[PDB]
């Protein structure tokens, strides 16, 4: 059963990252994995407030944009809002109840908080460019293409949370709930956590990239420069997040943490592969919806597509997976000046 | 029946603060209660890092304190570490799954985040004054004197968490679970939230204050000044947190947010009064503890206790509870030079 302050005096240095005794004393004088303490310090050094980025000229530039280019900017904004909305609460609600080491507990919390800063920045941009934000915010949940092309995300979290609840209440075994047989197994829960983690990783590694590239393309035609400065900050935060999920996944893979997680990573390898491939496809589909009731001059659905492939391969290899796409060179190296 | 992104387009202004549809889109262009957005704003403007306050000279001051003064300083730090260890994690684990308005959702992740900074600050202090932090950190979990408070506080959050889990897993009704009858009633669930929210108010309202007082007592004496600087940053954050729980409680009690909550607030009165008083008495016994070995210069058990009584009456009144102690002027006006 979960407790906010476990009463057993435990050596936190020997607990696994997940499924061990809930964290009791939050101390930062020692760590099982210093990478997490490093990441917290770095995120705290990058603290920024949106409020401090002038975006007044952007309302002018935006007003002057062709409808087709406006739809691209708005749509991306709507998409980033969906993601960061989910990224703000999810790590806290889904992982926090499973963490067993303090450095990771605090990291998750610092990471989810920085996502809320991102959310706030969208509000800042939006209310500075459109005379009524509700048009944008109200077409999110309903936008059939955002929900369609971003199908699967709440899914991994939602099932994990439900499973976690059953396990925290009932414990392992086969039970009878309202006449129904329900089986609770930790190994299964670990698979659910592992794949959730691999999906967050995909989200962090690839999902923002086509948005960033659009935003940045605008900045290269010398337009939407305040937005661009914000996206620059956001991207720098996402790089830390990703570095943090890659490490978690890789440490889990090495078998140096919980040994059962090393068997699970291996047996799930094919699903890891498929979800990444599914995500790439989703981004590619997004690429069309954007390059729809028109397009752009400097970029197009094919260029986007090449880039999504370019990036997905880099990212999959970082986590030890096989490459699904043909190897190519970055198709828009100009993005590199704005990145990380 | 909890999701990280509800698919129903809903009017977020019309939703209650808790137990409504889970929050989908995080937008901050509008709010049902401006207070929570204001709170997020101040807390961000107050951002600070413990690392930038120099604690080095505090080493010689602590080393030179009389032994029983070292016990007071340390026990206090231990107690503060306990409270903030619970406060970094809890609000997120306990409230997030029940919030239905975005501003509240965000404020709760910002609030909890600022508390991780407080715990980080206690390691910074501890690290800089003793040689082995493990001596401090390993005597909190099982230290008898601290322990009682921990159990009392955790309890409220824990029962709330468990009932929330059954609620979201099975919904209301009389259910069977392995031969056992289990009744789930939202009325009762509301009752448990009100009470845990009441105990956190007492926690922010009064339990930290007595620790502050002792910290500030040394500062008045020109001792342990780095610590005193950090504690001043901490008490400034605490004032905002309390402002939050006070507002939440008052909104609930007035029936303005959820009519049923006004009924629950009245049914619950005596017990809220009993809990605040119980909290106050622990602080007193805690003071009697601290000063068993003799007063520190400038502060003593009796004054402290008068101080608890004085602050309690204030806090209580603020949340419409009867005053349990005889009215008095603040017995240690000098604390105001350090608080706000
Ligand atoms: Fe983000
Ligand atoms: Fe992120
Ligand atoms: Fe605090
Ligand atoms: Fe606090
Ligand atoms: Hg996850
Ligand atoms: Hg996930
Ligand atoms: Hg699997
Ligand atoms: Hg894998
Ligand atoms: Hg509580
Ligand atoms: Hg609470
Ligand atoms: Hg003291
Ligand atoms: Hg009550």
From Swiss-Prot, chains A, B:
Its cofactor is Fe cation. It comes from Escherichia coli (strain K12). Belongs to the ribonucleoside diphosphate reductase small chain family. Binds 2 iron ions per subunit. It comes from the Bacteria. The keyword Oxidoreductase applies. It is an enzyme of class 1 (oxidoreductase). This is Ribonucleoside-diphosphate reductase 1 subunit beta. Fe cation 1 binds at residues 84, 115, 118. Keywords: Deoxyribonucleotide synthesis, Iron, Metal-binding, Oxidoreductase. One of its GO terms (cellular component) is ribonucleoside-diphosphate reductase complex.
């Amino acid at each position: 059963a979960y407790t906010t302050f476990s009463q057993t005096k435990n050596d936190q240095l020997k607990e696994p990252m997940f499924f061990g005794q809930p964290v009791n004393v939050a101390r930062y004088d020692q760590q099982k994995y210093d990478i997490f303490e490093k990441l917290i310090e770095k995120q705290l050094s990058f603290f920024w407030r949106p409020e401090e980025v002038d975006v007044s000229r952007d309302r002018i530039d935006y007003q002057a944009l062709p409808e087709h280019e406006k739809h691209i900017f708005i749509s991306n904004l709507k998409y980033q809002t969906l993601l960061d909305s989910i990224q703000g609460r999810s790590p806290n609600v889904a992982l926090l109840p499973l963490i067993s080491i303090p450095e990771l507990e605090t990291w998750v919390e610092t990471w989810a908080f920085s996502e809320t800063i991102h959310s706030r920045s969208y509000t800042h941009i939006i209310r500075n460019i459109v005379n009524d934000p509700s048009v944008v915010f109200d077409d999110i949940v309903t936008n059939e293409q955002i929900q369609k092309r971003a199908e699967g995300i709440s899914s991994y979290y939602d099932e994990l949370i439900e499973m976690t609840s059953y396990w925290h209440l009932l414990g392992e075994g086969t039970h009878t709930v309202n006449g129904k047989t329900v089986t609770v197994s930790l190994r299964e829960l670990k698979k659910k956590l592992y794949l959730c983690l691999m999906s967050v990783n995909a989200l962090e590694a690839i999902r923002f990239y086509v948005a960033f590239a659009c935003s940045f393309a605008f900045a290269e035609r010398e337009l939407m420069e305040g937005n661009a400065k914000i996206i620059r900050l956001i991207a720098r935060d996402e790089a830390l997040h990703l570095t943090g999920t890659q490490h978690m996944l890789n440490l889990l893979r090495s078998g140096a943490d919980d040994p059962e997680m090393a068997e699970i990573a291996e047996e799930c390898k094919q699903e890891c592969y498929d979800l990444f491939v599914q995500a790439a496809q989703q981004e590619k589909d997004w690429a069309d919806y954007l390059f729809r009731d028109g397009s752009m001059i400097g970029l197009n659905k094919d260029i986007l597509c090449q880039y999504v492939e370019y990036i997905t391969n880099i990212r999959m290899q970082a986590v030890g997976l096989d490459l699904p796409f043909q190897t190519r060179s970055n198709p828009i190296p100009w993005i590199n000046t704005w990145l990380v």
